[PDB]
């Protein structure tokens, strides 16, 4: 019954990697902001939070039950051993994905990428972030793939 620590830590890393890749694959449309997982005695749980609280919670509970069944049936989880908790937002120290999604789904419906860059820059520095960088790699004007990197604010790279 007894298990070591390193091996189950790596197994939890596997589970975390798969859940997060699946999450970033699907849930990018509905405005999720911060997602985590937590542990209770013989019980695992996944928690999500966003500005669109009930929207991420979903309609008819389809997302909740569907993805919980997915993880339950894939990761050897015994039935019922996954649930969703609740939380709330403290402040705006993690405000990137809201404007990122805004620009993304403006561009998907028809919008210039650099207009979105202007907007996201100005909203991010109105929010109070110190500095922001957006690197769009590919073709923007012509068939030369220039990695258009837009910086603003300060960026340190050296130190603990």
């Amino acid at each position: 019954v007894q298990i070591s620590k390193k091996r189950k830590f790596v197994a939890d890393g596997i589970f975390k990697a798969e859940l997060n890749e699946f999450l970033t694959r699907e849930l990018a449309e509905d405005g999720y902001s911060g997602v985590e997982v937590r542990v209770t005695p013989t019980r695992t749980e996944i928690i999500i939070l966003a500005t669109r609280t009930q929207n991420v919670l979903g309609e008819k509970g389809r997302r909740i039950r569907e993805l919980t069944a997915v993880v339950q049936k894939r990761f050897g989880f015994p039935e019922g051993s996954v649930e969703l908790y609740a939380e709330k937002v403290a402040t705006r120290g993690l405000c990137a994905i809201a404007q990122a999604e805004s620009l993304r789904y403006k561009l998907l419906g028809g919008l210039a990428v650099r207009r979105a860059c202007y907007g996201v820059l100005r909203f991010i520095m109105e929010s109070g972030a110190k500095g922001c960088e957006v690197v769009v790699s590919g073709k923007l004007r012509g068939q030369r793939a220039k990695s258009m990197k837009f910086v603003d604010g300060l960026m340190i790279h050296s130190g603990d």
């Binding site: 798969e18 509970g61 997915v70 894939r74």
Partner: protein, 97 residues
């Protein structure tokens, strides 16, 4: 798509009795992990999966060696029509709201 239909109706029946189901894609396996002690050829069921996802009734998804279903109102209704399930069955995943 060349699996005898008895396994097809069995898989559909267990699908609707359980809801969604999982899929592992590999030809080298002798017997299915969850469907063990039955000796079901995996290639045929894989073709059935890609056919039903190409037929346009469950949103086709290729997710990194491990496949799941995409359940919706339209998908459930189509499965009900295709398996001719009685007009009294409700999936166990929607219990107690």
């Amino acid at each position: 798509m060349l699996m005898p239909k008895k396994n097809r109706i069995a898989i559909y029946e267990l699908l609707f009795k359980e809801g969604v189901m999982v899929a592992k894609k590999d030809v080298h396996m002798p017997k299915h992990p969850e469907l063990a002690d039955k000796n079901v050829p995996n290639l045929h069921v894989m073709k059935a999966m890609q056919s039903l996802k190409s037929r346009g009734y469950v949103k086709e998804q290729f997710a990194w060696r491990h496949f799941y279903w995409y359940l919706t109102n339209e998908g459930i209704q189509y499965l009900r029509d295709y398996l001719h399930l009685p007009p009294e069955i409700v999936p166990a995943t929607l219990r107690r709201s």
